[PDB]
Amino acid sequence: GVFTYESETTTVITPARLFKAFVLDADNLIPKVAPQAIKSSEIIEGSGGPGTIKKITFGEGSQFNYVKHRIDEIDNANFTYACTLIEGDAISETLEKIAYEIKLVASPDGGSILKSTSKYHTKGDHEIKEDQIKAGKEEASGIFKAVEAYLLANPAAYH
User: Are strands 3-11 and 53-57 parallel, antiparallel or unpaired?
Assistant: First the structure.
C-alpha cells in the first residue's frame, strides 16, 4: 500500500542556493531555523552527495521518534537528489521506509523549483499510519519553507 505525497518549494533564489546551501548547510539550518521539522539534523559524514548520511531527530516526534536519512541518490547532471531511511526508529514495526526525491527545476521567476515528491514504501501489505506519513510531508514542509525564508531573509536580514 505505497502512499505518495509531494510538495513544491518554488524559491526566488537560484538553483545553486538549493543544490549547495539548502542541502549541504542543512545541519546548520534545519535544527535551528526549521525546528518544526527536525529538532536535530546531525550529519555524520558526506560532502552533500553520495553516502551523505545524517541522523534525524524530530522535535514533534519528541526525540523518541527519529530516523537516519541519507542522500540515497544524487544527479549532478540535471540536479536531482533523494533521501532514504537507513537507520533509526520511526517506521519500524512491520513497515519499510518513506523516501524523498527532490528535483531541481529552473523557475520562470529566475529562481528555482524544488519538486519534493515522497514515496511511502510499505513492507508488503502492511500500511503506514498517517502519523509517519505526515512526518514525511511536514519534514519537507518545515525544512524547505523555513530554510527558504531564512535564505530569502538573510542578505538583508532585517535591514
Answer: unpaired
DSSP code of 155? S
What CATH code would you report for 1-159?
3.30.530.20
Length of the chain measured in residues: 159
Residue 45 bridge partners (DSSP): 53
The arrangement of strands across the sheet holding 97-106 comes to: 3-11, 112-121, 97-106, 80-89, 66-75, 53-57, 40-45
Domain ranges of the chain: 1-159
Question: How far is CA 125 from each of CA 40, 110, 116, 122, 128, rounded to the nearest angstrom?
Answer: 32, 44, 25, 7, 10
| DSSP string over 124-146 | TT-PPPHHHHHHHHHHHHHHHHH
AA letter at 102: I
* Cβ contact 105:93 at 8 Å: no
Q: How far is CA 108 from CA 10, 44, 46, 90, 124, in A?
A: 10, 36, 32, 38, 41
CB distance 80 to 72 below 8 Å: no
DSSP secondary structure string, 6-26? EEEEEESS-HHIIIIIIHHTH
